Amino acid sequence: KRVFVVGGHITTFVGKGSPLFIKENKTLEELLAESINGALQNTGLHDGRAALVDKLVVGNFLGELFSSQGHLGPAAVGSLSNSSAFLNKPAVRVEGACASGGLAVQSAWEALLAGTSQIALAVGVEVQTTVSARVGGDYLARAAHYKRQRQLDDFTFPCLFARRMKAIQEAGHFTMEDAAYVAAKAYASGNRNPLAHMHARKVTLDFCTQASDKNPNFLGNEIYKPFLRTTDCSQVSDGGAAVILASEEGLQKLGLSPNDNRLVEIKSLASAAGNLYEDSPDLTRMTTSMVAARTALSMAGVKPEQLQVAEVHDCFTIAELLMYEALGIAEYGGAGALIRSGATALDGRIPVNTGGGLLSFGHPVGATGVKQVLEVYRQMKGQCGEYQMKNIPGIGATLNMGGDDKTAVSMVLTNI
Amino acid sequence: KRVFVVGGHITTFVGKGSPLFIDKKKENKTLEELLAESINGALQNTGLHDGRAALVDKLVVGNFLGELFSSQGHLGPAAVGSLSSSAFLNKPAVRVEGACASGGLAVQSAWEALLAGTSQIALAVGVEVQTTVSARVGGDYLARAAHYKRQRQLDDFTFPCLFARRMKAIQEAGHFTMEDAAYVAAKAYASGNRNPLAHMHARKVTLDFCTQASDKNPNFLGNEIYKPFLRTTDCSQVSDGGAAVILASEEGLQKLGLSPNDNRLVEIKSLASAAGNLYEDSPDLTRMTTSMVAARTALSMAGVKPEQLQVAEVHDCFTIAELLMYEALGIAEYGGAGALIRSGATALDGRIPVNTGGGLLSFGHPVGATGVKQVLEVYRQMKGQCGEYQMKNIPGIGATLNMGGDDKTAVSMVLTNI
């Protein structure tokens, strides 16, 4: 049993600060329908041929809250509205905070590997633009241990990293200044990607560094307030991303080949999750994410250098740093290196978040997990346009994270 | 690859009308509490001794409206520290959701995992606290299981309205009596009276009271169209409670040191998922096709007829559902639901005991939990554990049928006693 990425579609990521943000805004249903249908063409399923799927997996976090909506499993089925025929197929919403996307994958994964499916669709989506940021920051706290952590601020989720930050610099583990380097990189990266939430924007590294008013310590908190600049914060984005997956059997039905140019194969997927209550005593580690990483690669049998490209959960500049660390692409404390070495950059030896990552491309939660993969696919298939890689990678991987290293998902992809 | 049910634990189902429910002398149970309970409880029945609790490879939570009632999502890691011995850390965990079938789904995940080999031993836990808000409020939250923007329009009690309409129609099709919906009702209630776990254990009334002609049992629907097509009898319960279950592979057994025919267990040989169009509403309201699909598949995977079994647990979100459930499986033929419900074969002394502990109507309906409860129930009856509703004639063959929404999602399973 082996798994091939076929294709998919990432919608544009919009939200407040995007010129596309408002005519009436896009709906979660719309957004969903789009990401689905869009995935069909790139996979050539579109008109009536759209019924060769055995399973639908939705990855969403806060539908029930922002858009007052759960039960998106069957909502998948009628995103075709005649041509509408997904009816009576396995469908389900899954949820793991910010890693809901990677999870949506793990389901389809296990299914085909069972044989329930040989062809499946995983779609992440996330509309978050229906409420205030105060309100939305509350809804976000559902990813935390609410009753004992919302206590921090109305912007609860920022506060946890400000603290992971605050500590980790004084441990002489890296410069908060390194958190500006990451920032600059992914932003200018976003400037090469028209899908990006923050494509139409950039500013000085110094502006990303500190000394800012347009980039303030917005935290209502009076303790970890300065340990976070708006730079380091991700985006509140709307948008979807769908992906079609197949088995060798699924291929045969589709009439394809295990080495057919059109595809990329997956040979690793690893899930791991920790204690929502018992907070890490080592804030300079993403153990879950460290765990998840190590497993996947070990399942495929490669070293953390044997690859060329990566997409990781930069919910904060901080995260990306730790992400570097949370994988064997970077050694302990030495995150300051590769970020400045610029190996993580597009011309760098190890391009990472070439389209901008969560910071710039944006962070529609459910969607984020799927986006990573599709991104790695396009770079593998020369599709990344003005941030397309010169030197095409045949080996790539992903790292999706929910909460505070609470959940983590990883994957191994090989270009064929 | 083959799947053995090990054991588990169902907590008591409480909620407004249960003497255990607190109205302003003590503080109610929390989703977190409720979760911890169901987890820990599952451990002993499985002997996962104190620190021996770390032989699991995967945690699957089934919840629906945590984010709403209790303002809480991300229950995956919330599992990990329900031990506060606390060492579930850094294991695969995830919340899944499929409205009312979220429980069955939680199962399908663990299922596929062990079958992969990611796990050989997994825990699926359903839980659902729904008692933090008004019923008006709660009925809204419930509408998230519907196609909200185009269906909340019915009433603040949206989900009731859809069945009142499935009802309204189906009687005039001469498919069954609304009076049959009283027969189902009485059964599961008196059934609940033999089960102290039941939400509605401490209650019963006349069949006539379940039939109609009632004021204590009114047409509460704010709606003025399908209002009379539903009696409070036919409505399920708004319950709090959890149910956890430990599952293993032959490998998991060997680690646990067991045997594929060891008395302590029951094996699963079928699981089927299916789901339809949240938007395109059924033109045949006298059918649970999804649920019909799901059913047929599972059994066909195991290779049995719908009579080759002895016992069942099905999604009686309404008396109506159960009826259709009967139909949605080959235990009952089209229109002829009025039969077996009156034949009383579905009853405990009946040839085909169904929802012996009371089902959703009486035992109660904590949504996430419901899917898991079915299985555990089928287990206990198989293991003589059902006490005052324990079966005389023990079954070696059983099955389940979980449903989300309006036949929108359905899950089914095949269990064989060994």
From TrEMBL, chain A:
Instruction: Return the PROSITE patterns for the record.
Output: THIOLASE_2
Q: Which CDD domains match?
A: SCP-x_thiolase
Q: Which GO terms describe its molecular function?
A: acetyl-CoA C-acyltransferase activity; acyltransferase activity; lipid binding
Q: Which GO terms describe its cellular component?
A: kinetoplast; mitochondrion
Keywords of this entry:
Acyltransferase, Lipid transport, Lipid-binding, Transferase, Transport
Q: Which InterPro entries match?
A: Thiolase (IPR002155), Thiolase-like (IPR016039), Thiolase_C_2 (IPR055140), Thiolase_CS (IPR020613), Thiolase_N (IPR020616)
EC number in record: 2.3.1.176
Specify the Thiolase C-terminal domain's residue ranges: 278-414
Thiolase N-terminal domain location: 23-249
State the source organism's domain of life: Eukaryota
Q: Which GO terms describe its biological process?
A: lipid transport
Per the UniProt record, one Pfam family is Thiolase_N
Protein name stated in the entry: propanoyl-CoA C-acyltransferase
Which gene does this sequence derive from?
A: Tb08.26A17.500
